[PDB]
Design a protein around this ligand. Structure first.
Ligand SMILES: [Mg+2]
Ligand SMILES: [Mg+2]
Ligand SMILES: [Mg+2]
Ligand SMILES: [Mg+2]
Lengths: 116, 116
């Protein structure tokens, strides 16, 4: 089973590619995905008081699913690495938002790790 | 089609996770995969004269497919992100080795990018 091998990986993986300012992320637990992570020009990288609380919505033309952390970090171009079909859409959207919030928070931790 | 969305991503993505010394890679062209990338204790990070020329083999107990760059960099725990079944095994193994050699070479470029 491929899904089990994912479990050998750390839950959140932060990625980059040469020649690219945009970054990338892989989420290795359900719902598993690859996503692009981009940053507003005025992104600070300072952790907020309350936990991260972003929104998933359809944006741009054509409308594409995207995640706005509300802190300057975006996730887009999602690719689901599971082949199942989620029974409940509301549940699936919710589980995906919660994974994005953690990824966003995990990314803010990168900067504070480096200051230490 | 999921495969086409992969094409929006840069071919090779280099990853890390907090709390982990091992690193990660995602290859976004055929054959697409996620892999763990690890390093001998005496890894230098200096580019070689001739191109990278690693080997894929079965290693460890139980025997697992792994890639040895012969330069200190390893790839293991491969997860194929395509669901097809390769017609020819020799061809498939070969295409995978060639992707690993580029990934290894792309990783050596990370260090020389940073020196510049
Ligand atoms: Mg617009
Ligand atoms: Mg950052
Ligand atoms: Mg041994
Ligand atoms: Mg390195």
């Amino acid at each position: 089973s491929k899904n089990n091998i994912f479990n050998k990986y750390p839950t959140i993986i932060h990625g980059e590619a040469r020649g690219e300012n945009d970054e990338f992320v892989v989420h290795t637990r359900y719902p598993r995905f690859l996503a692009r992570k981009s940053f507003d020009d005025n992104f600070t990288g300072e952790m907020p008081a309350k936990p991260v609380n972003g929104e998933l919505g359809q944006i741009g033309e054509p409308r594409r699913l995207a995640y706005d952390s509300r802190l300057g970090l975006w996730l887009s171009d999602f690719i689901m690495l599971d082949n199942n079909k989620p029974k409940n859409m509301e549940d699936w959207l919710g589980q995906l938002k919660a994974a994005c919030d953690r990824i966003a928070a995990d990314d803010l931790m990168l900067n504070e790790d480096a200051a230490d």
